[PDB]
Design an enzyme around this catalytic site. Sequence first.
Site, PDB file in Angstrom:
ATOM      1  N   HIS A  21       1.584  -0.702  11.337  1.00  7.65           N
ATOM      2  CA  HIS A  21       2.634  -0.408  11.452  1.00  7.65           C
ATOM      3  C   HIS A  21       1.905  -0.173  13.107  1.00  7.65           C
ATOM      4  O   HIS A  21       3.479   0.519  13.723  1.00  7.65           O
ATOM      5  CB  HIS A  21       3.605   0.667  11.175  1.00  7.65           C
ATOM      6  CG  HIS A  21       3.430   1.795  11.541  1.00  7.65           C
ATOM      7  ND1 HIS A  21       3.028   2.925  11.729  1.00  7.65           N
ATOM      8  CD2 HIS A  21       3.364   3.141  10.274  1.00  7.65           C
ATOM      9  CE1 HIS A  21       2.681   3.684  11.619  1.00  7.65           C
ATOM     10  NE2 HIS A  21       2.583   4.077  10.551  1.00  7.65           N
TER      11      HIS A  21
ATOM     12  N   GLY B  50       1.792  11.704  14.598  1.00 10.11           N
ATOM     13  CA  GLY B  50       0.294  11.117  15.801  1.00 10.11           C
ATOM     14  C   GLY B  50      -0.476  11.326  13.563  1.00 10.11           C
ATOM     15  O   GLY B  50      -1.973  11.041  14.472  1.00 10.11           O
TER      16      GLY B  50
ATOM     17  N   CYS C  96      -0.434   9.334  11.139  1.00  8.62           N
ATOM     18  CA  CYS C  96      -0.654   8.663  10.844  1.00  8.62           C
ATOM     19  C   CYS C  96      -1.915   8.074  10.651  1.00  8.62           C
ATOM     20  O   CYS C  96      -2.916   8.108  11.524  1.00  8.62           O
ATOM     21  CB  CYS C  96       0.649   7.851  11.154  1.00  8.62           C
ATOM     22  SG  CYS C  96       2.098   7.455  10.972  1.00  8.62           S
TER      23      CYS C  96
HETATM   24  O1  LIG Z   1       7.475   9.347   9.755  1.00 10.40           O
HETATM   25  C1  LIG Z   1       7.114   8.769  10.398  1.00 10.40           C
HETATM   26  N1  LIG Z   1       5.862   8.858  11.666  1.00 10.40           N
HETATM   27  C2  LIG Z   1       5.673  10.009  11.990  1.00 10.40           C
HETATM   28  C3  LIG Z   1       5.257  11.364  11.576  1.00 10.40           C
HETATM   29  C4  LIG Z   1       5.539  12.880  10.958  1.00 10.40           C
HETATM   30  C5  LIG Z   1       5.701  13.483  10.209  1.00 10.40           C
HETATM   31  C6  LIG Z   1       4.298  13.183   9.297  1.00 10.40           C
HETATM   32  N2  LIG Z   1       4.219  12.156   9.151  1.00 10.40           N
HETATM   33  C7  LIG Z   1       4.612  11.353  10.102  1.00 10.40           C
HETATM   34  N3  LIG Z   1       6.932   7.035  10.158  1.00 10.40           N
HETATM   35  C8  LIG Z   1       5.914   5.656  11.203  1.00 10.40           C
HETATM   36  C9  LIG Z   1       6.261   5.189   9.907  1.00 10.40           C
HETATM   37  C10 LIG Z   1       7.599   4.958   9.472  1.00 10.40           C
HETATM   38  C11 LIG Z   1       8.386   4.284   8.043  1.00 10.40           C
HETATM   39  F1  LIG Z   1       7.622   2.790   8.227  1.00 10.40           F
HETATM   40  C12 LIG Z   1       8.610   4.255   7.436  1.00 10.40           C
HETATM   41  C13 LIG Z   1       9.559   7.278   7.584  1.00 10.40           C
HETATM   42  C14 LIG Z   1       9.181   6.812   8.633  1.00 10.40           C
HETATM   43  C15 LIG Z   1       8.471   6.952   9.160  1.00 10.40           C
END
Ligand SMILES: O=C(NCc1cccnc1)N1CCc2c(F)cccc21
Lengths: 303, 301
Positions: A41, A143, A145
Amino acid sequence: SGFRKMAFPSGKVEGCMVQVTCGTTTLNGLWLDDVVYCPRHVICTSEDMLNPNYEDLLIRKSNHNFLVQAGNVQLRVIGHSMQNCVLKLKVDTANPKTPKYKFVRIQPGQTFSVLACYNGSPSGVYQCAMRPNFTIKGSFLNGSCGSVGFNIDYDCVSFCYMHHMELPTGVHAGTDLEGNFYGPFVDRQTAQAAGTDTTITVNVLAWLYAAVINGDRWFLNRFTTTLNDFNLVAMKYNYEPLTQDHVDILGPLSAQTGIAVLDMCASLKELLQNGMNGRTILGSALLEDEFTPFDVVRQCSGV
Amino acid sequence: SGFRKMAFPSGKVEGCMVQVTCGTTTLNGLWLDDVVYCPRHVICTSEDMLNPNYEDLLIRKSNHNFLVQAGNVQLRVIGHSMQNCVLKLKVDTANPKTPKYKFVRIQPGQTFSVLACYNGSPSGVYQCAMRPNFTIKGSFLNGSCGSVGFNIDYDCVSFCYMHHMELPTGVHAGTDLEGNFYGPFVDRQTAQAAGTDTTITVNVLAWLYAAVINGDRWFLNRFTTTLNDFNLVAMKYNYEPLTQDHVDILGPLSAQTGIAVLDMCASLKELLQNGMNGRTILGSALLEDEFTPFDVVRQCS
Ligand SMILES: O=C(NCc1cccnc1)N1CCc2c(F)cccc21
Ligand SMILES: O=C(NCc1cccnc1)N1CCc2c(F)cccc21
Ligand code: NA
């Protein structure tokens, strides 16, 4: 003495974390030999993220569109390719700190250490389990990921998790290092939710065995039980069924403490039915299910 | 989101752990530059431990009585001296993996990461606090002595703890890296016992501010309190007094959440009175006191 949620030492993995930037997206990558692994992604914008066609987005990119930073140093991307939901960036330099490692897929119930990172810079380490519903209860901000989970099995690091997303209930979803999701999740912005979770029975019993080893014994009783009757009770309280395989796995702890698994199950039955009556176990008022039998033996006998 | 007991990445410390042997005693040492720090009780025998005279035991030792092993390699000891309850062994090779570091002595309530080690080889990493009674609730077996506690703020490792002993109640005592014990403890096997422990009030408040930040509000109420009435109630549940210093320290978390410190104090009073009524806060059914205000700002938002 003492019993603590304990992570593996994270040093072998620290030396593999890098920053990967693509357009305005910056996140974390894992540098092993001459490949950097990260969530695919990274190539998406907001709009893309709604309904991405990864193949199509990727073919539009040159190597030089991926900026990879290992501490202060830029690495040159000389190749790029996808495996499932992870991007593999070939770089010109092999990681001199590459440990002995494998990629492994873990089962729900199994635990691992997470090294949380931001901008390729490790910030924290904690212990997690793969929930029966294939989520993890992590601690992750924007951040994070590309942060990874691992076990250390000798000198060999077994990578088992890469972080991709947060679900609306504030729990976490990700893939193995071959890019296959744990759980029925996808890397796009649609409506997704954690399924209802269950308690990992075999782990709770392991932690009860740990409590006894540490002198916490008040919940033992004179009763024993059968697998079937116990499993009737487990199902009622949203506990995972206990199998013969589980009983076998607890064998060591049973022998060491003189409490047969079904004896300990009689204890757990009572706790589930009656509660704790104001008492704690290893400093907790709830039954802990994020320690495996192996975790307990490792911490209560050795290095 | 989520909230976890989170340790610092341990790699900068792993590169410093060695095995130190004297006679039949083996334990862990910390190799920084050309000095190895370890507990002075490494020089004690069976008999010694009741009333050791360390100066007398030490004068009888030569450099080559101390075997130091860094992974596969032996280091040559070229010097030794004692400082308080730690031995400093001078070695012939400086540690090429020495991080930027300092020694700091911490106050009760402060948290740190522990790297537990056996035979100079790290086993696990976990988060601890210095209890008000100057013990730590660790996880340590025989051979863990010389394991260390640290924080890493920036790229600088701040060493704050070295493990020396287990008390009868299964909690842990040790020193700063200048060899001064935390609390009234001594490296003798006499009868000594942990003082009664209290809960670290300022940390519990910080953790309540964390639960608000992560979206959880059920425990607030419409009341406030004076500092003094709060303390009069707190002490009855074995909570540490809260000082003005503590109130100042919570200022940022107050500003971020829009809840005044004494209002949060009112909330804690009620929680202590009522318990939780089957609810949890950040996944706990007890009030957590091993996260500092600093830790909460570090992990949250
Ligand atoms: O949730 C995130 N990103 C930020 C984050 C914040 C706190 C903890 N973990 C990650 N994302 C990016 C990609 C995504 C999908 F494809 C589908 C749902 C969610 C997300
Ligand atoms: O208790 C120990 N060593 C073993 C141990 C076991 C579990 C965890 N940590 C350490 N010791 C060594 C030194 C000592 C004293 F001087 C006074 C009382 C006790 C001890
Ligand atoms: Na029983």
